[PDB]
């Protein structure tokens, strides 16, 4: 599947077992309106880019 | 050490003229090896097809049962057996703070077929209603149920099976009952929940081949 860019728009909350994954609201650079929720490792900032291997799957919001 | 699907003929299934999409799908049978015959073993198979698939595209919550009452040649000819609403629909309708009214009539068509029709209807909450409940008193319930039976009998009794299926393809019976019971207590989610087949007349072929065009 083509690799697609999701842009962090608003960092929401921290998740995982040991508080290790930042759960972030992403706004797609490809489609104008589609905004999904993704679990992300490492430190992430409000207003930067992610390279998603799939642009359809969504993580369970808490 | 015998591949058991080597001796299997596929047969195309045909629905009667009352539906848009004719052919339902395919059916497996064993080749006539010994005394027991492919077509005779194939005769009396019940196919439960959703009306969405049976028409082109519509309601998917109403299902029709169809019996292969005869086989002409590489073609199963099905005929209306029964009808049933889907679990999802019936479970979704039945919700709390209202009265559920159920009727059943044992009525016979002009030709041999004697059906058992089950009607269901739920008391509707008014547009400006502030009272939570919206229940019907017992005499209001059995006046509604008496009227349910009176329409359900009248609609089938006087015409033949080709026309009763033409009424069950929409829900003309349920819409007629719903409008009729507006004075006693306004119902909303009124359908003919289920149609059963108790008796058929002794099989004819000329009567089948009028239903198959």
């Amino acid at each position: 599947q083509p690799i697609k860019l999701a842009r962090v728009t608003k960092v929401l909350g921290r998740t995982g077992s040991q508080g290790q994954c930042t759960q972030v609201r992403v706004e797609f650079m490809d489609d104008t309106s589609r905004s999904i929720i993704r679990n992300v490792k490492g430190p992430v900032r409000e207003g930067d880019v992610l390279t998603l291997l799939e642009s359809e799957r969504e993580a369970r919001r808490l | 050490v015998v591949d058991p699907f080597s001796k299997k003929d596929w047969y195309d299934v045909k629905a009667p003229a009352m539906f848009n999409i004719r052919n339902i799908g395919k059916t497996l049978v064993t080749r006539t090896q010994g005394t027991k015959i492919a077509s005779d073993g194939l005769k009396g198979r019940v196919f439960e097809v959703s009306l969405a698939d049976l028409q082109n595209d519509e309601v998917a919550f109403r299902k029709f049962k169809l019996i292969t009452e005869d086989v002409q040649g590489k073609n199963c000819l099905t005929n209306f057996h029964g009808m049933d609403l889907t679990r999802d629909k019936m479970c979704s309708m039945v919700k709390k703070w209202q009265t559920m009214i159920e009727a059943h009539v044992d009525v016979k068509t002009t030709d041999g077929y004697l059906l058992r029709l089950f009607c269901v209807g739920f008391t509707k909450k008014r547009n400006n209603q502030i009272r939570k409940t919206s229940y019907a008193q017992h005499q209001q319930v059995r006046q509604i149920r008496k009227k349910m039976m009176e329409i359900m009998t009248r609609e089938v009794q006087t015409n033949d099976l080709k026309e009763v299926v033409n009424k069950l393809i929409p829900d003309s019976i349920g819409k007629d009952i719903e409008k009729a019971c507006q004075s006693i207590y306004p119902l909303h989610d009124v359908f003919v929940r289920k149609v059963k087949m108790l008796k058929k007349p002794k099989f004819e072929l000329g009567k089948l081949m009028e239903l198959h065009g």
Partner: protein, 136 residues
């Protein structure tokens, strides 16, 4: 081994009865009639341990073998008839229901129409276990 349907567009439909108890999973394809069986791969045929007959894993293996087995006979798409145990017992499907339905969609089949067909009784016979239930 020859469904004489058209190569381009024509989908040949089966119907898959996924009986998912809390200690076994069945995946069982038949005719639209429901009379003639094509496949039946249980959760227990695949794995050899009693404690994981009702596994998402075992149900995933079972649905994969069913998908592969029915692709050869020429069943392209499937209608679905999911059920728990029912009667007096549980009416929530087993933990293998999800993984099996997922598995024969990951394995390149087509999904027609789905519905619950659990034996829901009007009112039933007395349930197993005493008046005081299953105490543990």
């Amino acid at each position: 081994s020859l469904g004489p349907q058209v190569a381009e567009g024509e989908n040949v439909f089966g119907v898959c009865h996924i009986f998912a108890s809390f200690n076994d999973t069945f995946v069982h394809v038949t005719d639209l009639s429901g009379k003639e069986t094509i496949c039946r791969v249980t959760g227990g045929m695949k794995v050899k341990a009693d404690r994981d007959e009702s596994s998402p894993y075992a149900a995933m293996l079972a649905a994969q073998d069913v998908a592969q087995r029915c692709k050869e006979l020429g069943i392209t798409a499937l209608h679905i008839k999911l059920r728990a145990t029912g009667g007096n017992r549980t009416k929530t499907p087993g933990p293998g229901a999800q993984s099996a339905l997922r598995a024969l969609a990951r394995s390149g089949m087509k999904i027609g129409r789905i519905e619950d067909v659990t034996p829901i009784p009007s009112d039933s016979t007395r349930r197993k276990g005493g008046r005081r239930g299953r105490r543990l």
